[PDB]
């Protein structure tokens, strides 16, 4: 017969964006990141996007019986400093198999280490062109 979709209840409509100031939320983020660092799920990093972009990386995904290892080229780093957000874009090619992964830091069953903070933009461009050509070939063979 009849129903109501909105509620003007005071407890529901009231907000706390004005009082969010007394909560050290950024300090909580940093504390979570530091707890992860001290536990060992991640390792602190301080690099910029253009510096890390194009640097080889090795990632081991722990798995009984054999942990799977993968050597790729860092294509994009989402964060310049360590945080709970993180994010890395790696590109690795096996024998006739290309793949583009988004590795999040802090996973205990995942240990990724960049072999050098320095990167070569030339090799980055080479890997980017290879990946784009593979993607275009796949799409053309599909359609």
């Amino acid at each position: 017969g009849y129903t109501r979709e909105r509620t003007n209840r005071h407890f529901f409509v009231a907000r706390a964006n004005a009082f969010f100031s007394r909560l050290p939320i950024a300090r909580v983020q940093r504390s979570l990141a530091m707890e992860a660092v001290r536990e060992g799920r991640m390792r602190p990093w301080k690099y910029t996007k253009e510096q890390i972009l194009g640097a080889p990386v090795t990632c081991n995904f722990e798995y009984n019986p054999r942990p799977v290892r993968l050597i790729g080229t860092v294509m994009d780093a989402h964060t310049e400093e360590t945080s709970i957000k993180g994010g890395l874009k790696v590109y690795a090619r096996n024998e006739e198999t290309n793949m583009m992964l988004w590795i999040p830091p802090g996973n205990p069953k995942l240990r990724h280490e960049v072999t050098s903070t320095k990167g070569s933009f030339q090799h980055y461009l080479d890997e980017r062109d290879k990946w784009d050509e593979a993607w275009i070939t796949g799409r053309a063979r599909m359609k």
């Binding site: 007394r22 909560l23 909580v28 707890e35």
Partner: protein, 344 residues
């Protein structure tokens, strides 16, 4: 559960010695009518029955002699006194939190959980209210987010004055049992909740305004039809009913969001009792700053939440020890993580 007719409550179905009321003192025989004329012609007034006497005597002897063998049979008498936490009767009031932010965590098995952190600024038991003093009709109002006096409206500042509790921004009522009371003005520490605890949360999702019938119901809104009219299954005769009006509940375009949404049975992830934060692995729809309300889940899968196998709650409410100082205690020291769980 198991069906049990009231007519099956005779002494031939009782598991323990059936005790008749018999005025002030319980007896093992039905109350003999004081007026002898009331004796029905076939009613056999029993004063002493050796069968029942021997059975009851042996039962009492064994109960008093072997307490370890007959420990479970002790609930027949000396029941648990009122005031102690009960597994099937004691429900405690929840709290009022503020959705602080979102992050992602990982368990030791390797599962990723996109969690949201709620913040409980100042939880204080504000009021008690029962309607006309009936059973189970009493509830406790808890207030949150202490504010100055120039903030609230006059008619609500007047209530906070009348109560004497420091004026809070919001106030939510939780219906509880009388043995779970807490004096007015009691501070509620976040450790009132446990990390391995299922919680039911209620909030207000975000507002999208007037949205199309496609965006409201997704693919469901495009096709809406319902016919309760009679239709001939076999060509034998002719007869049907015309669907004159549109049946109530027809899915159309209208207000979207800005409603009271309730999630039932989400487990807690971690608790920080220095900044009063709770983490839940479920992504909510509400905005940042929506005053959510947390309450305890009654039971799931036919199993009560609070039991000896899982753990005992902080009944009625968690009170910290005296020598504990959250100022001296660091942030990393105030972290309680739930035991691992896999959901795939």
């Amino acid at each position: 559960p198991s069906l049990m007719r009231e007519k099956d409550r005779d002494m031939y179905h009782c598991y323990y010695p059936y005790l008749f009321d018999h005025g002030d003192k319980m007896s093992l025989y039905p109350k003999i009518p004081e007026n002898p004329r009331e004796w029905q012609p076939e009613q056999l007034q029993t004063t002493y029955d050796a069968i029942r006497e021997d059975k009851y005597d042996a039962f009492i002897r064994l109960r008093e002699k072997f307490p370890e063998l007959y420990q479970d049979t002790r609930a027949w008498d000396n029941p648990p006194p009122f005031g102690e936490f009960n597994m099937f009767y004691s429900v405690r009031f929840g709290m009022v939190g503020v959705k602080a932010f979102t992050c992602k965590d990982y368990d030791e098995l390797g599962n990723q959980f996109d969690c949201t952190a709620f913040w409980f600024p100042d939880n204080q038991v504000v009021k008690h209210s029962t309607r006309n003093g009936e059973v189970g009709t009493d509830k406790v109002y808890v207030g949150a987010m202490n504010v100055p006096v120039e903030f609230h409206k006059p008619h609500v500042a007047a209530f906070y004055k009348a109560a004497g509790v420091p004026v809070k921004h919001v106030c939510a009522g939780f219906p509880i049992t009388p043995d779970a009371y807490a004096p007015v003005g009691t501070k509620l520490d976040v450790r009132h909740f446990k990390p391995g605890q299922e919680v039911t949360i209620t909030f207000q999702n975000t507002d999208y305004g007037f949205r199309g019938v496609m965006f409201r119901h997704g693919f469901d809104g495009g096709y809406v039809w319902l016919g309760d009219s009679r239709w001939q299954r076999r060509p034998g005769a002719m007869g049907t009913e015309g669907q004159k009006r549109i049946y109530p509940g027809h899915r159309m375009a209208g207000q979207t969001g800005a409603a009271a949404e309730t999630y039932q049975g989400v487990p807690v992830w971690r608790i920080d009792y220095k900044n009063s934060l709770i983490y839940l692995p479920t992504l909510l729809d509400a905005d940042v700053g929506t005053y959510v309300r947390f309450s305890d889940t009654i039971n799931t899968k036919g199993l009560t939440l609070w039991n000896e196998h899982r753990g005992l709650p902080a009944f009625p409410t968690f009170i910290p020890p005296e020598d504990e100082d959250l100022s001296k205690l660091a942030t990393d020291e105030c972290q309680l993580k739930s035991p691992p769980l896999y959901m795939y």
